[PDB]
Amino acid sequence: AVTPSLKNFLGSLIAGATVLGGIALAITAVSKFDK
Amino acid sequence: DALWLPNTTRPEWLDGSLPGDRGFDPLGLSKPSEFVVIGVDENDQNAAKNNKGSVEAIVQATPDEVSSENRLAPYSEVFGLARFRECELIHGRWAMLACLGALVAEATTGVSWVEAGKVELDGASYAGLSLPFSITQLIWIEVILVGGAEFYRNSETNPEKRCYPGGVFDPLKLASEDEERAFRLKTAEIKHARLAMVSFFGYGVQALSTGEGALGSLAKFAD
Amino acid sequence: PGLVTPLGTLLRPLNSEAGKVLPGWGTTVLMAVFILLFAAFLLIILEIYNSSLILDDVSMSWET
Amino acid sequence: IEFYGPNRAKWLGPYSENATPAYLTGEFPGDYGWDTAGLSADPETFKRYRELELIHARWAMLGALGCITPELLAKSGTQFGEAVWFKAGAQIFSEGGLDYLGNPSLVHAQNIVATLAVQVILMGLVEGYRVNGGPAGEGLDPLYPGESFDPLGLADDPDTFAELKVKEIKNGRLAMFSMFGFFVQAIVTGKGPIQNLDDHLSNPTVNNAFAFATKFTP
Amino acid sequence: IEFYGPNRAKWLGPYSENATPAYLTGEFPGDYGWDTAGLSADPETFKRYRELELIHARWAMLGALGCITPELLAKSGTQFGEAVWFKAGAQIFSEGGLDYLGNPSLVHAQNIVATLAVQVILMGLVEGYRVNGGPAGEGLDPLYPGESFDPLGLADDPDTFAELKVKEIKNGRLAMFSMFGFFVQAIVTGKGPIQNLDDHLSNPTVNNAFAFATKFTP
Numbered sequence: 018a019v020t021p022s023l024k025n026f027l028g029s030l031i032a033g034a035t036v037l038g039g040i041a042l043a044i045t046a047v048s049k050f051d052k
Numbered sequence: 053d054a055l056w057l058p059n060t061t062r063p064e065w066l067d068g069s070l071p072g073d074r075g076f077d078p079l080g081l082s083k084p085s086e087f088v089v090i091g092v093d094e095n096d097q098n099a100a101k102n103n104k105g106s107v108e109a110i111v112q113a114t115p116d117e118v119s120s121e122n123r124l125a126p127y128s129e130v131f132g133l134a135r136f137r138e139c140e141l142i143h144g145r146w147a148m149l150a151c152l153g154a155l156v157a158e159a160t161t162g163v164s165w166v167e168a169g170k171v172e173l174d175g176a177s178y179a180g181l182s183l184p185f186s187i188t189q190l191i192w193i194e195v196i197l198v199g200g201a202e203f204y205r206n207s208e209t210n211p212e213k214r215c216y217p218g219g220v221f222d223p224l225k226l227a228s229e230d231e232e233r234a235f236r237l238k239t240a241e242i243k244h245a246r247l248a249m250v251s252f253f254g255y256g257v258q259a260l261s262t263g264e265g266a267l268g269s270l271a272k273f274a275d
Numbered sequence: 276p277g278l279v280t281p282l283g284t285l286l287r288p289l290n291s292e293a294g295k296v297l298p299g300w301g302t303t304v305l306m307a308v309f310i311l312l313f314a315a316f317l318l319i320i321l322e323i324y325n326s327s328l329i330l331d332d333v334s335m336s337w338e339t
Numbered sequence: 340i341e342f343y344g345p346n347r348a349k350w351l352g353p354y355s356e357n358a359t360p361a362y363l364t365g366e367f368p369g370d371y372g373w374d375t376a377g378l379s380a381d382p383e384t385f386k387r388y389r390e391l392e393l394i395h396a397r398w399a400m401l402g403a404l405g406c407i408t409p410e411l412l413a414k415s416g417t418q419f420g421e422a423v424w425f426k427a428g429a430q431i432f433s434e435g436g437l438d439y440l441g442n443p444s445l446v447h448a449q450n451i452v453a454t455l456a457v458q459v460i461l462m463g464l465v466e467g468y469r470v471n472g473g474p475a476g477e478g479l480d481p482l483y484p485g486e487s488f489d490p491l492g493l494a495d496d497p498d499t500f501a502e503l504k505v506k507e508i509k510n511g512r513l514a515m516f517s518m519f520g521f522f523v524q525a526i527v528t529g530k531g532p533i534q535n536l537d538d539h540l541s542n543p544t545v546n547n548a549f550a551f552a553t554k555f556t557p
Numbered sequence: 558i559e560f561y562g563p564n565r566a567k568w569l570g571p572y573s574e575n576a577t578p579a580y581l582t583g584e585f586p587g588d589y590g591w592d593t594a595g596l597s598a599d600p601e602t603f604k605r606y607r608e609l610e611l612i613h614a615r616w617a618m619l620g621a622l623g624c625i626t627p628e629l630l631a632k633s634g635t636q637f638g639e640a641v642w643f644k645a646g647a648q649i650f651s652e653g654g655l656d657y658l659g660n661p662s663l664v665h666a667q668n669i670v671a672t673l674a675v676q677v678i679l680m681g682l683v684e685g686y687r688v689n690g691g692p693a694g695e696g697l698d699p700l701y702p703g704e705s706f707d708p709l710g711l712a713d714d715p716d717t718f719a720e721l722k723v724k725e726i727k728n729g730r731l732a733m734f735s736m737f738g739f740f741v742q743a744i745v746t747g748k749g750p751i752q753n754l755d756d757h758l759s760n761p762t763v764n765n766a767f768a769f770a771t772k773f774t775p
């Protein structure tokens with residue numbers, strides 16, 4: 018019983034996790050590169 | 053020989069001297085790990101330049117599981133075998149009594165352990181014999197008697213005898229003065245306790261799954 | 276050498292554990308998991324209350 | 340009648356198949372020397388093919404018996420809804436999910452992608468354990484572990500152990516042959532195999548296999 | 558080097574059976590060790606498998622991007638008539654031939670068998686060049702030539718060039734996996750892939766893949 022509001026909602030909880038993961042990977046890609 | 057993981061990496065602080073010892077720590081909650089002690093900061097605001105805590109100051113306070121006399125927190129630490137054995141044994145004995153009592157009450161009366169309170173606050177019918185009490189007096193008598201029992205069981209200072217007391221009163225038949233016989237009886241009791249705790253957890257999950265009786269669930273199961 | 280009460284004898288092991296704190300990380304990552312779940316919970320109830328997230332059993336009609 | 344040494348019984352018979360593929364003379368169960376392609380001249384590759392044949396046999400026994408059993412139960416004394424191993428997949432989308440054992444009081448499972456995700460996680464963990472051991476005993480044999488996997492201890496005598504090896508791989512080759520039979524008749528008859536057995540018992544000679552021979556006509 | 562050597566990132570992580578098959582221990586990019594079948598026990602055969610895999614990867618990149626492109630162009634700013642790679646083949650037979658970009662101001666070739674003949678001639682010449690080594694660079698390596706047909710030539714620093722080797726192989730395996738996905742979707746749904754992505758975004762929990770799971774039944 019998923020409405021279209023919840024349908025387009027859960028992609029945002031996906032997308033914010035992808036943004037924070039991109040932040041963390043941008044940290045790891047240059048931080049442990051330099052050190 | 054008969055571990056939960058049969059011939060794998062054993063935990064260091066589990067050997068087999070305890071009866072139900074099968075080398076079971078993925079979490080390591082019984083670890084002998086120390087505790088880094090940080091002193092108090094300079095909380096004297098009479099003078100200038102107060103400071104903060106002290107990093108790697110003390111020798112980190114080698115943890116001990118010796119039972120003290122203080123009625124509030126006797127063992128002085130929680131993470132240890134000298135508390136966890138007693139907690140497992142007491143939870144297992146209450147779970148054995150409760151799991152037997154729910155089945156016997158459902159078999160005799162026909163009312164679940166869930167719905168027993170709704171049929172026993174209006175009438176105190178132990179198998180339909182109409183006891184004279186009421187709920188307030190039941191709570192008073194229950195609290196004062198079980199409280200006296202618990203304040204008398206905490207008074208024992210032997211860390212062995214806080215779960216394995218022995219003597220004359222509780223071992224009525226003296227069948228635990230032997231070495232290997234009592235070891236076999238303890239390692240049987242702990243397995244029956246581990247079964248009963250998991251099955252009362254199953255009773256709770258069946259109660260969460262829209263009502264049960266441990267045979268009312270079977271009446272649902274009937275086909 | 277202060278003042279002694281029976282409550283002063285009772286409550287002392289509660290005021291005994293001064294500084295026994297863990298080295299390493301401890302339960303920090305699990306704490307972070309609970310914090311993220313709590314933030315998602317607040318986001319859920321906020322969008323329900325704003326009705327940017329329409330559900331089935333939620334009426335929002337000022338009527339029940 | 341010994342299945343080992345130089346005197347193993349060939350698949351042919353008294354024709355001992357002169358000029359054998361010479362890279363196997365006994366020493367392993369199931370050896371008949373039937374290597375016509377000869378894909379395993381290298382012994383490491385040959386060991387890998389032993390591993391792969393063993394794992395496929397031990398899957399194929401369960402894949403056989405799970406496809407036999409519920410049709411027998413539904414014909415004998417129960418009802419399962421869609422008791423045929425074709426429509427066992429489509430049982431989920433039918434009414435309200437898959438009711439196991441034909442009972443609408445037990446499992447009653449939906450959310451097929453969640454079931455698949457649970458299956459992926461569980462099978463990945465048990466295969467990652469299966470390859471290099473870890474728990475469940477030290478990783479000791481990629482072929483025949485049997486430390487806790489033989490909890491009755493039938494690996495005591497090595498001669499009887501080799502006998503059980505030979506019985507194991509004979510029965511495994513039979514199961515792997517039978518499952519390919521199921522997969523071919525799955526396309527051919529579109530029916531249950533016990534129904535096919537009853538149809539053969541009805542018509543042993545006039546509807547046996549060649550009635551279903553004019554299907555794939557372009 | 559973390560990417561390849563004694564401590565390469567093996568293909569199953571902690572459960573990656575950390576004692577490789579001894580016929581390969583690093584020495585080449587893209588090496589994890591996933592030859593469980595053992596089909597490359599001989600080093601010359603293993604060299605042939607690299608020779609085949611790198612060429613399939615380098616065709617798989619262009620085969621991926623050529624199918625990603627035209628529906629994105631049709632969404633953004635163009636139209637092609639039939640902008641879908643399914644019916645792109647019949648566009649020469651459509652009305653008067655095919656129009657690249659949908660533009661009859663450029664090539665617009667007809668006589669599909671003559672275009673096939675030109676394709677056969679030019680591909681035979683360039684594949685013979687790739688095999689032996691001829692003009693526009695003499696053959697020195699069948700896989701990593703590196704000569705004046707590199708207008709930038711990033712093979713100067715050996716460590717960064719090995720990193721580029723690893724990146725090329727990883728993108729190649731990903732392109733192969735993607736094109737296998739395109740082929741299986743071409744079998745199943747009969748729809749454009751970006752259309753399939755939009756349909757899954759429209760219906761995630763019902764039109765995922767198991768809606769198209771009752772098709773190949775008897």
Ligand code: CHL
Pocket residue numbers: 348349350351352353373
């Ligand atoms: C005495 C003579 C003797 C003969 C003739 C055979 C025969 C055979 N044995 Mg052997 N055996 C014999 C002795 C013994 N065998 C065995 C135990 C075994 C085992 C365990 C196995 C064999 C196998 C084999 C086969 C090896 C090659 C093969 O796989 O062919 C297979 C290919 C064919 C038979 C050709 C197919 C002919 C078929 C009629 C075609 C159908 C026509 C279609 C209509 C065409 C389709 C049309 C389409 C295009 C539309 C071969 C058929 C192997 C086997 O059976 O694999 C299948 C095998 O695993 N034998 C024992 C006991 C130890 C024997 C003792 O006497």
Ligand code: CHL
Pocket residue numbers: 424425426427428429430431451455458522525526767770771773774
């Ligand atoms: C792994 C074994 C397995 C096999 C062989 C099948 C195959 C089947 N499923 Mg099934 N499933 C399997 C497991 C699972 N399925 C499902 C979920 C479903 C659903 C919802 C449905 C099916 C249906 C079907 C049928 C489709 C007919 C067909 O596509 O013809 C192709 C197959 C054949 C012609 C013969 C089969 C063997 C043949 C040699 C091909 C197999 C190739 C490879 C061995 C498979 C590749 C291995 C993988 C791991 C890479 C057929 C019985 C449909 C159905 O019910 O139809 C009535 C259907 O609706 N399945 C799940 C949960 C996600 C599974 C979990 O393991």
Ligand code: CHL
Pocket residue numbers: 459463464467566567568569570571572591
């Ligand atoms: C953490 C544990 C871990 C697990 C479980 C896996 C899992 C896997 N990795 Mg992997 N990896 C893991 C760690 C790591 N990997 C990698 C990097 C890689 C790479 C580069 C590759 C893998 C590959 C693989 C696969 C190797 C085995 C195989 O071929 O599948 C065989 C088993 C199956 C295919 C079973 C799948 C079940 C499926 C649900 C069946 C579908 C059911 C159908 C309904 C039935 C069919 C019906 C019929 C009709 C068709 C496997 C899926 C390989 C791969 O991706 O191949 C595809 C690969 O190339 N991994 C890294 C980085 C160093 C890891 C570090 O932690």
Ligand code: CHL
Pocket residue numbers: 642643644645646647669673740743744
């Ligand atoms: C080599 C790559 C190649 C592939 C994969 C295709 C495939 C296709 N062409 Mg095509 N063509 C290809 C090259 C060429 N075509 C044409 C000329 C045409 C015409 C005129 C038409 C097609 C059409 C088609 C479609 C036929 C549907 C079908 O048969 O389903 C089977 C295929 C699948 C289900 C997917 C693939 C499954 C499998 C992985 C096949 C792969 C086979 C091998 C692994 C790869 C080949 C190896 C080579 C080196 C021998 C399909 C999209 C028709 C069309 O567009 O209809 C709408 C059509 O009218 N082609 C020319 C010029 C002569 C080509 C030269 O490069």
Ligand code: CLA
Pocket residue numbers: 029030031033034035036037038311312314315318
């Ligand atoms: C640090 C940067 C940052 C922050 C704080 C925000 C914050 C916000 N943005 Mg925003 N944004 C950012 C960067 C950021 N943005 C960037 C870089 C872009 C360009 C792509 C955008 C483009 C953008 C648009 C286009 C919109 C927003 C909007 C919003 C608002 C609502 C978002 C929402 O509901 O999601 C809620 C998200 C969460 C609660 C986070 C999910 C956390 C849960 C618990 C999951 C846990 C993590 C998950 C597992 C992933 C981890 C990966 C794992 C593998 C480890 C919010 C104020 C909206 C707006 O302006 O409102 C009008 C909107 O429409 N953003």
Ligand code: CLA
Pocket residue numbers: 397398400401482483484485486488489493494503504506507510
């Ligand atoms: C009848 C087929 C058969 C036979 C003869 C064998 C034989 C053998 N297996 Mg084996 N195996 C089989 C099927 C079989 N297996 C299947 C189907 C699986 C997958 C589950 C395995 C998985 C397996 C492993 C993982 C291991 C073996 C091992 C062994 C060897 C020693 C153990 C032994 O004596 O088993 C004798 C077996 C039998 C006599 C078969 C008895 C069949 C009973 C009577 C039927 C009961 C089935 C039951 C109804 C199923 C439902 C119950 C379920 C719901 C719980 C020997 C080669 C071990 C080994 O080689 O290491 C040393 C080992 O580690 N096998």
Ligand code: CLA
Pocket residue numbers: 568581586587588589590591592595596597603606607609610613730731733734737
């Ligand atoms: C064009 C196909 C092709 C070929 C020839 C190779 C060749 C090779 N790969 Mg490779 N690989 C491929 C595609 C291919 N790869 C794809 C698509 C992936 C991503 C999943 C990988 C991922 C991969 C890893 C992670 C590793 C290799 C490795 C190797 C090398 C040793 C293994 C071997 O003997 O393979 C010989 C190859 C063949 C005999 C080709 C068989 C083609 C079959 C018939 C295809 C159909 C079966 C298939 C399994 C069906 C299911 C498809 C499904 C998995 C999507 C060898 C050079 C190892 C290495 O060191 O890298 C250099 C290694 O660790 N591969």
Ligand SMILES: CC1=C[C@H](O)CC(C)(C)[C@H]1/C=C/C(C)=C/C=C/C(C)=C/C=C/C=C(C)/C=C/C=C(C)/C=C/C1=C(C)C[C@H](O)CC1(C)C
Pocket residue numbers: 373374375376377378395396398399401402403405406424427515516518519
């Ligand atoms: C030796 C030799 C020699 C020469 O020289 C060469 C050559 C010829 C190459 C060779 C041969 C080979 C062979 C014979 C092979 C075969 C194979 C097979 C058949 C397999 C199967 C195999 C098979 C198998 C695994 C099977 C499996 C099964 C399964 C999964 C199943 C599943 C299921 C079940 C449970 C039930 C449910 O309800 C459903 C289903 C889902 C259905």
Ligand SMILES: CC1=C[C@H](O)CC(C)(C)[C@H]1/C=C/C(C)=C/C=C/C(C)=C/C=C/C=C(C)/C=C/C=C(C)/C=C/C1=C(C)C[C@H](O)CC1(C)C
Pocket residue numbers: 591592593594595596613614616617619620621623624642645732733734736737
């Ligand atoms: C390694 C190993 C190891 C172990 O031991 C064993 C085993 C497992 C067996 C193995 C594995 C293997 C595998 C997996 C393989 C796979 C492969 C693939 C998938 C490929 C693809 C592959 C793929 C590919 C090439 C593709 C390509 C493509 C192309 C060209 C395309 C083209 C096109 C285009 C542009 C578009 C247009 O309009 C048309 C066309 C014409 C259509």
